[PDB]
Each structure stands twice: as structure tokens, then as C-alpha cells.
Amino acid sequence: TNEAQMAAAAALARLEQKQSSQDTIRNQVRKELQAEATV
Amino acid sequence: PNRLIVDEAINEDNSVVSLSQPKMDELQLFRGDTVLLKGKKRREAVCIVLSDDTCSDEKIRMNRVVRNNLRVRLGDVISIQPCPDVKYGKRIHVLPIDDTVEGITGNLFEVYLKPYFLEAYRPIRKGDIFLVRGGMRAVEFKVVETDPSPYCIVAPDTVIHCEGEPIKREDEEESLNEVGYDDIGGCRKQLAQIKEMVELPLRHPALFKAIGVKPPRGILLYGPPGTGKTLIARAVANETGAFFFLINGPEIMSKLAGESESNLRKAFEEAEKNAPAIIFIDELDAIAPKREKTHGEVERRIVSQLLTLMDGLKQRAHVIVMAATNRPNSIDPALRRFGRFDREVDIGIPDATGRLEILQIHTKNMKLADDVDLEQVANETHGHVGADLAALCSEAALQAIRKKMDLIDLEDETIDAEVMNSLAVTMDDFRWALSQSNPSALRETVVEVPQVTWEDIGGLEDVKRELQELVQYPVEHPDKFLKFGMTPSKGVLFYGPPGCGKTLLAKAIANECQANFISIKGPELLTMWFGESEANVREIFDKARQAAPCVLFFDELDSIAKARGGNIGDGGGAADRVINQILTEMDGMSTKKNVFIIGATNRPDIIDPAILRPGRLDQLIYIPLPDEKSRVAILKANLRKSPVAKDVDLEFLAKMTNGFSGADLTEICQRACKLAIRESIESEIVPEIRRDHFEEAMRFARRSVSDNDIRKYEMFAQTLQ
Amino acid sequence: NGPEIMSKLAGESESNLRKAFEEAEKNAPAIIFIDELDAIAPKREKTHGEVERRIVSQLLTLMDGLKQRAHVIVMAATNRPNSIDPALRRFGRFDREVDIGIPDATGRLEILQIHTKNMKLADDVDLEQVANETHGHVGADLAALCSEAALQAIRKKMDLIDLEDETIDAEVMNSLAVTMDDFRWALSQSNPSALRETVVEVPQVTWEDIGGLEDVKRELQELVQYPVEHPDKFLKFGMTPSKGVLFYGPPGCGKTLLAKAIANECQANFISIKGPELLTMWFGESEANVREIFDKARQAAPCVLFFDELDSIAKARGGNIGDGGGAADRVINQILTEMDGMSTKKNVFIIGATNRPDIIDPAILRPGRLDQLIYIPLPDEKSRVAILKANLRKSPVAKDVDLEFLAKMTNGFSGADLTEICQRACKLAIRESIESEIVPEIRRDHFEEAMRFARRSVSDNDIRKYEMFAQTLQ
Numbered sequence A: 001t002n003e004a005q006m007a008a009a010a011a012l013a014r015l016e017q018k019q020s021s022q023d024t025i026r027n028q029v030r031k032e033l034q035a036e037a038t039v
Numbered sequence B: 001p002n003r004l005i006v007d008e009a010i011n012e013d014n015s016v017v018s019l020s021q022p023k024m025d026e027l028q029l030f031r032g033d034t035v036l037l038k039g040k041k042r043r044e045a046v047c048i049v050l051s052d053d054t055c056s057d058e059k060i061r062m063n064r065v066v067r068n069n070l071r072v073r074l075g076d077v078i079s080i081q082p083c084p085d086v087k088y089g090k091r092i093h094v095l096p097i098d099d100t101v102e103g104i105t106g107n108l109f110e111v112y113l114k115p116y117f118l119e120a121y122r123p124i125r126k127g128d129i130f131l132v133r134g135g136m137r138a139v140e141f142k143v144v145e146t147d148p149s150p151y152c153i154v155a156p157d158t159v160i161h162c163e164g165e166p167i168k169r170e171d172e173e174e175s176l177n178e179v180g181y182d183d184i185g186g187c188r189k190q191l192a193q194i195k196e197m198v199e200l201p202l203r204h205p206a207l208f209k210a211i212g213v214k215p216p217r218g219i220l221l222y223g224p225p226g227t228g229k230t231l232i233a234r235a236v237a238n239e240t241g242a243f244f245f246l247i248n249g250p251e252i253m254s255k256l257a258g259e260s261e262s263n264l265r266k267a268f269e270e271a272e273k274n275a276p277a278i279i280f281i282d283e284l285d286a287i288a289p290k291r292e293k294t295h296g297e298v299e300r301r302i303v304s305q306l307l308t309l310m311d312g313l314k315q316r317a318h319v320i321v322m323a324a325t326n327r328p329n330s331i332d333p334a335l336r337r338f339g340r341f342d343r344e345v346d347i348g349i350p351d352a353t354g355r356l357e358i359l360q361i362h363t364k365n366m367k368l369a370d371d372v373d374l375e376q377v378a379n380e381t382h383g384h385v386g387a388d389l390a391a392l393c394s395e396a397a398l399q400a401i402r403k404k405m406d407l408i409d410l411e412d413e414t415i416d417a418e419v420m421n422s423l424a425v426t427m428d429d430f431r432w433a434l435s436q437s438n439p440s441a442l443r444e445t446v447v448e449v450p451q452v453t454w455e456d457i458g459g460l461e462d463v464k465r466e467l468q469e470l471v472q473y474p475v476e477h478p479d480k481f482l483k484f485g486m487t488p489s490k491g492v493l494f495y496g497p498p499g500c501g502k503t504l505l506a507k508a509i510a511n512e513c514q515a516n517f518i519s520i521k522g523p524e525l526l527t528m529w530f531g532e533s534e535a536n537v538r539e540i541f542d543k544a545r546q547a548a549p550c551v552l553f554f555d556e557l558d559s560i561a562k563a564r565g566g567n568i569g570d571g572g573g574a575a576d577r578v579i580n581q582i583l584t585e586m587d588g589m590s591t592k593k594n595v596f597i598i599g600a601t602n603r604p605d606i607i608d609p610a611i612l613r614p615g616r617l618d619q620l621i622y623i624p625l626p627d628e629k630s631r632v633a634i635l636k637a638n639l640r641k642s643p644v645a646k647d648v649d650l651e652f653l654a655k656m657t658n659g660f661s662g663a664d665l666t667e668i669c670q671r672a673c674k675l676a677i678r679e680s681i682e683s684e685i686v687p688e689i690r691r692d693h694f695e696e697a698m699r700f701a702r703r704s705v706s707d708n709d710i711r712k713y714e715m716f717a718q719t720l721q
Numbered sequence C: 001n002g003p004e005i006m007s008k009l010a011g012e013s014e015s016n017l018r019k020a021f022e023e024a025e026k027n028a029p030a031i032i033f034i035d036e037l038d039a040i041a042p043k044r045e046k047t048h049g050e051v052e053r054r055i056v057s058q059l060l061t062l063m064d065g066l067k068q069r070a071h072v073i074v075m076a077a078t079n080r081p082n083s084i085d086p087a088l089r090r091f092g093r094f095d096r097e098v099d100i101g102i103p104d105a106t107g108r109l110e111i112l113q114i115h116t117k118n119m120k121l122a123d124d125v126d127l128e129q130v131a132n133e134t135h136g137h138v139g140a141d142l143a144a145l146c147s148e149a150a151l152q153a154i155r156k157k158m159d160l161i162d163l164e165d166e167t168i169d170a171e172v173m174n175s176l177a178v179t180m181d182d183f184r185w186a187l188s189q190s191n192p193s194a195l196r197e198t199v200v201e202v203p204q205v206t207w208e209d210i211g212g213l214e215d216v217k218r219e220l221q222e223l224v225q226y227p228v229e230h231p232d233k234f235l236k237f238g239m240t241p242s243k244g245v246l247f248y249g250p251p252g253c254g255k256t257l258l259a260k261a262i263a264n265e266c267q268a269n270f271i272s273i274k275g276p277e278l279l280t281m282w283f284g285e286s287e288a289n290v291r292e293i294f295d296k297a298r299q300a301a302p303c304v305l306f307f308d309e310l311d312s313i314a315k316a317r318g319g320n321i322g323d324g325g326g327a328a329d330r331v332i333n334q335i336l337t338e339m340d341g342m343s344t345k346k347n348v349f350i351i352g353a354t355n356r357p358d359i360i361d362p363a364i365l366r367p368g369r370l371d372q373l374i375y376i377p378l379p380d381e382k383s384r385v386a387i388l389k390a391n392l393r394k395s396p397v398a399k400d401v402d403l404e405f406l407a408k409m410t411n412g413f414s415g416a417d418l419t420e421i422c423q424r425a426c427k428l429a430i431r432e433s434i435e436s437e438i439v440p441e442i443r444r445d446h447f448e449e450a451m452r453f454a455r456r457s458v459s460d461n462d463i464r465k466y467e468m469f470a471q472t473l474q
């Protein structure tokens, strides 16, 4: 039913958050940006 | 009917269970539907079912929280049924467990239950136990009362109550903070091997006593201190339910003559009375070291007493004795004879992947800041064992605590949950602790699982195929090798200029073949030569055998020849202490162990020709500098995930870098990226790596292999025909 | 057993040992088996404790008391005859010895058949194939192998039928067959306990495996068979049999196969000592191990003891440059001593091989040592044909393959070089066969393609070196 469908959306969202290229590339650039900012 | 075997889960969410797709269609439920699970003692649990591509068709993957609620253990069988009529609840009353909330005070709802339940749409049944982590504690709660029955889903408008005293834990209900399989990070291959050996006779004792097949009676674990040898022994006993009895050397050795022998014997008698049972003997080398290393009468007698007690296991049915030592040859060899401790598992040291898993486990309760990077730490913590990474996390936690406690000045007997819940540990706290930590295994041999794939290696398309023929075909198509009377080669040597991927080729083939990778470096062979400790060569090949299937990569084969003068040499021949032991081990190694020996050198002209005879490294592969199409492929591989601008002409760059090796092309790719990033931060005092950034990198990069070296390598390869 | 006696306190271990002998006499005829003897009476040099010295004396007196304890025989088990107090092996007591050793491929098959008598095996199970793969295993390991293979088959079915009760249904076990995949898995998990032990067995190499060298084959029979097949003729003519022969010549010409083939036909045990082992003794100053090698040769007699790479040490010392010393060294001196003390009545024949006879200590060539010398040249045309056909004896060679043509072309190739051609052509046939599934025989194209990579390993510069030496010996 619809109450289970809302539980389905929550279970799938947590699975995707646990599984998670874009954040690895952005984080690697962020680290290099801070080093170039202070050097 | 709908009866499936309980297995381990990957998803850490307590409300989620995974079933394989074929069961999603046979049970006629949609992804995310709510189902009930039937356990033991007329108990059940409600959860949400998701699908994945890793669950076995006939198994259900669930974590410890769900298994405890069902009072089931791994390997048992439960029934699953849909319940699509579950509705929302309006009132849920949750109280903490007395054995988990202690020494802490504050508003438990705001810290734990609110973020857990708020808009969480979790299925909840009366009597469920669940765990909420945070504030450097692991606090479990029980659900005591709900308006709907016997289960419901929590809604955004559900009122959560928490009024009353903590709940006294039931004697049949195990705490969720007890050691289990989900507390072990690396060394998962060893844990799986052990489970297969012990879980069958422990869970199904009626099977073995009714058949002609005898179980294992003893397992010897070994590796450096702090690698989880005891952690595994406890996890196995706690997950199977076997009675766990702990023994340790110092406890037995500190006793007087007539007391140490009786106490050791009693431990065996107690295990039998409580069978099925596991006896874990830690620091075994302290009870029964090699007899040649002891002179006292008491020490020799206690060795004989242990040997007789181990032999008594023919009568003590369903008792398994596990022991932990540092080295398999530090103890009385009698213990390792047929029977007694005739099984061996090498725990060793976790690699970079295992170290990351350990850091994630020991930070589950810690609030980490966005700047904390545990993968970066795992790559830097070479030579560390799990006990070192656990100490690293603890030290970082204490540094973060001191910084806040000296400012808030709240001194009482209990700690405020809100104060700890809002305390985050930053990269400065892990970096400080990392500089203070000192690895316990700085120079130990580490067996790694390779992460290099063929997509990471540019060019050399014909070598990739050749290596598959040498490494995969002998075991993928054994009927053809038997038909044609072919004897597979035992290894291959790479030669050619440096920085062309010789090491990557060995790792990539090991990866595709699902084999372990062992790396031996020149300085280690020099250490064995100079220190007259060439016996350590056997340990290298012994790990290769036990770690099979594996690829054993010997780098810098010429390290000793150069130390002996290289081009001038001395009064002796090519043979030396270390190469002789290596050649001996190679000759004594069979192809049936699935151990492939790979060597590499940058000076093939000075390698003892003996190692190239049939039966050794008879196959020779030349790895030249990359050609025009390979250099482009190398640039693309290094930039596979980089934000390369459309104006970058990778073919033009490859045409200029005619004398560059793959190692030099990588520096260009990395420098061009850093240059683009430098421009980015400067604009605030850019989204892509522009042609100017690659052209600028070209002015700093240099070729590592000169024309004189290219001719030397080409002439050598030509001489070999 | 050792641990049972040693775990007891002073005054209890001696009493219990005495009681065992008294009970055996009361129940005579009787056999007393003492396992782990080295744990009760180790070589005295290894123990100084008052209790350990006394229990040795108690065992010695009880063994001597067997003159009165009629019909009582005492058997003991040890790992090495030299690990125990030498007094035990004096006239009387334990004056007989039996060398159990390690089962060979035939014995391993018999063990596997015994420990599977109760097991239902699938049609794909081939225990002879397993026996050939289980190198270095002893009966204890083959028993564990059968257990692991049986348990794997059980696990696979039990997790499917889900029958949990106090007893097991006979029909469930009776219909459970153990497949070859379960044995192969168990082989990957099993780890031989005797892998590093010396291997002493009758070789499977026969004369049909060696191409050419027809006259050398006959010469070895005269040197090795006749002294024991026709001893009355040697006595009649006053002939003293040779104790051994040294082979010299280019590498890869079959010197090792010659030693194995004669051992096979004579049904004698073959013992192989390799260069790295001679170098290990030289580098580690452990030449005493040579005496154990020659003593094992006597224990395994009739046997052929083959010393390969006899020049390995001379080369390690510089070979062509050398050092300030002479040809004698630690390891060869022990070999010379053991040979001089060995009688021809033990039926132990010594064969050596070297690729550099010009640097062999001349002492080994004197009468009483390796006084015979046989030159093994590179094969001629008719021998190269025999070598190719011998190496391909078991391969599915197509009828279009002209092996005589190849022999006519590969004039500078050694026997080992002809094998590389045979194996390379086989690999090419395997590649073609595998590709056809993504062939039944090795085609001419596979041999001709192999010739693109095959090269001679022995150059004319080294052939002259051997010819000049062979001419020097006339």
C-alpha cells in the first residue's frame, strides 16, 4: 500500500547514500585548492 | 514454502533486508514492499525488502539487529511473507536498555530517537531491538508500546515517547555491542575460510557423529600482534553460539608446578561439559615454544600436557581448539602433526583496502567532519595493523574532546549526550594522532589484493593477450593442455626501460584472475644477502603457496648484482646466498599450486642466466617505450576521469612526447590538472583543464629514458631474437 | 607415547614406563609400541635435565630386561634414527631399523583407494590423476584430502535437503556422490606435510624417452646391470666394477635422462642432487649433509645417486677467473670421502654430470671415484629425428607434419631446443583450439610458426670447448 511505498523511498535513498565519481573528483580538487590558497 | 537461508548483509540499515530478484518475482512483491519474517519462539520481524545483484537466490541478507530480533543465527532457515496492509502509527513508546545507557545523561530523543525515526518510514513491531550510533556511544533501544498492533510504520506525524526507567536486558537476548562478524574489517578471505571449517560441526553436530567424515579439531591462526586473531575467534563463537573458553600463556605460565597443568586440563574438561565449545589459546608460543628454546623441566612437561590434551579431542566430541601465535614455526612442531593443530590460517596484515574498512568500523560511533578522509589515511598508514588503526581513532577522539571540554567547563559524574553528539573530529585531529602513532609492522610482508585493471594500462595490447595465455589458459582450459601434452610455464620476466608498466602488467593479470599479489623489492633481497638470512626466502614462497592463487612479483632482480659491482663484479660467480634459495624454491614449486612467478629488471644483461632456464623464468617479454598510439592511450587512461577541456589535443601532445615513458606521461596529466586547479583558486583572489595547462606542463616534464638507454634496450632485445 | 610419559612428574614417569613392560609380559605374547621415541630418549647432547637423563636409563634397562620377558617385542617410531640416544641402537634393544619413507605415485593411489572404500564416487572421479598431482603428500595428508572432498559433497547437499534430526537417513548418504570438482577443491585446500623431504623413488623415464645416444645406452647397461646380473663373470676374470661415471658435454643433451633411464630399467631408486643444493651446503658451511645423502643412498639401495651441476661450486668461486685456492672445497671433499668408504656390495651407483669438465676437481676422476667418462655431444641428424618423435610421443601430431624435415634444418639445435619447438607448437595448437570455441591435432602450420621463434642455445664457441676437451681425453 501507500505507507509501504513511502518506506520504499526511504530504504532506496539510504542504499544510494551508502553506495556513493563526481564527489571524488570535487573532493580531490577542494584539497588542492586549499593547498594552493595557503602556499 | 518461502523458506530461505539467513545470510550476512552489506547494507547497514536496520530496516532493510535484501532478497535476490528471482525471489522478488516468486514471492510477488515490489521493490521496497513490507514483509514479515518468521523466526524462532513464535517471533517475527517487519522490514522493507530491496533487491540487488549479490544476494544468493535461496538466501536472505540481513544484519545482526534483524537476526537477534528473530532469534536466528547465520545458516538457519526462516519464512518470509508479504504484509502490504501495514499502516502508519500515531504513538510509539521507546525506552533505552539499562545495559547501554550508563554514565550519560541528556535528552535521548533529541540525540538518538528523533533523527532515527523522524521522516524515516521505518517498519516497527512491538518488542523490536534497534541500535542508534552517535556521540561515541552505541546505544540500543527497545520498543515497548504502540497504538497499532502488532506493527506499523512510523510517520512524520508520529509522536515518539520515552518516559520511564531503562529496560533490564533479558538473559536470552545478546547485546548488539558484542563481537560479531561485522566488527572485522580486512582479512575477510581468512574469516570465510575459517567459517567453512568450523560452522558445520558446531551448528550440525548430529551430522558428523553419524557419518564417516571427521571434523577438524584444531586451527592455528598466526600473524603480527594486533591483527584480529582473537577478534575472529570471539566473532566465530558468538555468531555460532558455541561456548567460548579463553586461555592465554601468561595466565598458565604464572602458575606453580602442579597448578599450570591442572588449570590447562580443566579448561579442556569445561569445554566438553559445555560442548559444542571453542577453546582459544592466545600467545601459544608462551606455553609451547619450540623445545630447543627452553631448558626448564616445567616448560617441557606443560608442552607434553598440552599435546596429550589435544590428542584427547578424539573423545571430547564437538570441541574445537583454536590457537594464536606470531609464527607457525615458533612452537613445538609436534602440535602441527596430523590431528591436534593440523589446520593453518595466515591472518597477516590488511592491505590499503582492509585498512580503510577497519577505520570505518572503529569510527561508526564517531561524528566526523567533512574534511576527514579515511581513505587518504589508509593509504598513508603503511605498516599499521588493526590495533594501530583503532589506537589512531581513539587518539583523534581524545584530542577533539580536550579541545571542547576545556571551553565548556561542565564537570559532573555523567557526560551530556548533546555535548558529545555535537562534537566532530576533524582532519587536524586524525593528522595529529597519525603523526603520534607508530606502526607495529613497519617492515613486515603484506599480501595485497590488486586494484589495477587492464583499462588502467595504455598500449601493450599484445602483451595483455600473451599474459592471459600464460596465466589464465592453464586453468581455464586444462583439457586442451592435457590433450596436447603442454607443460605450462611457471613464470615470466619483464625487461625494458623504466616507467613502462612492468609492475602494472603483473598487478592487472593478478586482478582479472582474482589472485593475490605479493611484491618483493630489491632492498629486501639485499638485506637477506648482507645479513646472511637467506632462509627468509622460504617465508616469501611459503606465503605465496598459502595465499594461492597468487602472483609473486620479484622486482629489482639485479639489486644484488649491482651491490657486487654490477659491471665490474668480484672474484666469484653469478650465484649467491639469496638467488640460490630463490632458485631452489622455484624448482620445488608445482604448477598445481596456482602460483605464478613474475620478475622484473631494468638491467637484464646482468641477471644470473640460471633463472632463465626451463622450469624458471623461461619466458621473456620486452616492454619498450610506448609508441604513438600507445602514448595517446596512456594519456586517455590517466585522464579517464579528469575534466579535460574540449580544446586539449591529446594526439598532438603524444606526438611531442616521443621520448617519454608512461611514467612521464602521467606526470604531465597530473601537472596539467594541478595547473588548472591553481588557476581556479587564483580567480577568487577553471571548470576544465585547458589546452594551455597541458602545454604549460610540457615545459616542466622531462623524459626519464635517454637515447643512450633506448639503444641499449633495443640492442639487447634484438640479441634475444 | 612420549607426551603421556613426559607429562608425568619425577617418580611417576619411570613407574608408568616400568608398568607397561610388566603388563606386556603378563599378557605375552605382546607388542609394545612407543611413539615419538625422540620425546622420551632424545640424543643425550640435547638434554641435561636430571629427570630426562634418568628416564633414558630406565628405558635402556627395560629394553635389556627383554632377555627374560619372553615373547615381548618392543617397536618404536621416530623421525630420524640419529635423533635418539645412540645407546638404544646397540646390539640388542633396538638393533633393527625399517625405513618407511614416503609413498610414490603408485602408493598414493593405493592409499586414496583405501580411504574411499566407503565413499560413493562419481564417474568423473579419477584417483590415479589425483595420485599424480599429490606430490609431497603422505598418507595422513591423503586421508585429509578424502575427508575434505567428502565434506564438500555433503555440505552441498545438506544445505538443500534441510533435514535436521538426531540420526541421518541412510538413503540420503547412499545417493550422495563425490565429484571430481570436490576433489580438486580439496586439493587446493590441502597442504602437503612432506613437500620438503628428499624424494627417493624409481623414475618413470625409460629408454624410449631418449632420442639417439644408442651407444651410451648400451654402455650404461654394461656399467650398471652386468655387475649384478652376471657377478660370476666378474669374479672369473678378476674384474673390479666401476663405482660411477661422469657425464660431460653441452647442456640440454639428455645427461639427466640417461641417469634416470638406467635406474628405471634396473628397478633402482633414483636420488637427484641439484646444483643449488650443493651450493647451499657450500655457502652455509654445512657439508656434513653429504654424509646423510650417501647414507640414504645405502638405505634405499639398490639406487643410483645422481650429482647434477657438479661444477656449480667451481663457477660460484669465479669459474673462468676463480680465486687464490685450488679445486678442492668443503662439499666435494665430503663427497670424495664418502665414495672412498662405500663398497660396491651395497649396489649403489654414482653418476655425475657437468657442463664444464675443465674445472672439475681432478680427484673425482681417479680410480675408485668417477673413473669413467662419457661425452654426450649435440645430436646428429638421425638423433634429432628421434628426439622430436620422442618429445612428441604423446602429442596428437598431424600426419602432415614432416619431423624429418625439421631435423634436417635444426642442425645447430640441442635436444632441449628441439623440445621448445615441440612445446611451442603445442601451445599454438591450444590457442587455435580455444579460439574455435569462441584443433583436433597439431598441424604443420603450428610447427612452422614455432620455428619463427625457436633458436639454438649452444653456439659454436662452446661446441669447440667440449670438442677440445674430448680430444684431450682421447
Ligand SMILES: Nc1ncnc2c1ncn2[C@@H]1O[C@H](COP(=O)(O)OP(=O)(O)O)[C@@H](O)[C@H]1O
Residues within 6 Å of the ligand: B183, B184, B185, B186, B187, B224, B225, B226, B227, B228, B229, B230, B231, B282, B324, B350, B358, B361, B385, B386, B387, B388, B390
Ligand atoms: N581486522 C580487524 N578488524 C577490526 N578490528 C581489528 C582488526 N584487527 C584488529 N582489530 C582491533 O585491534 C584490537 C586487536 O586486539 P586483540 O584481538 O586482543 O589482539 P591480540 O590477540 O594481539 O591481543 C581490537 O581492538 C580489534 O578491534
Ligand SMILES: Nc1ncnc2c1ncn2[C@@H]1O[C@H](COP(=O)(O)OP(=O)(O)O)[C@@H](O)[C@H]1O
Residues within 6 Å of the ligand: B456, B457, B458, B459, B460, B497, B498, B499, B500, B501, B502, B503, B504, B505, B634, B637, B638, B661, B662, B663, B664, B666
Ligand atoms: N602503459 C602505461 N599505461 C598507463 N600508465 C603507465 C604505463 N606505464 C607507466 N605508467 C605510469 O607510470 C607509473 C609507474 O608504473 P610502474 O609499473 O610502477 O613502473 P615500474 O614497473 O618501472 O615501477 C604508474 O603510476 C603509471 O601511472
Ligand SMILES: Nc1ncnc2c1ncn2[C@@H]1O[C@H](COP(=O)(O)OP(=O)(O)O)[C@@H](O)[C@H]1O
Residues within 6 Å of the ligand: C209, C210, C211, C212, C213, C250, C251, C252, C253, C254, C255, C256, C257, C258, C353, C386, C387, C390, C391, C414, C415, C416, C417, C419
Ligand atoms: N636425447 C634426448 N632425447 C629426448 N629428449 C631430450 C634429449 N636431450 C634433451 N632432451 C630434452 O631436453 C630437456 C632437458 O634434458 P635434461 O636431461 O634435463 O638436460 P640436463 O641434463 O642438461 O639438465 C628434457 O626435458 C628433454 O625433453
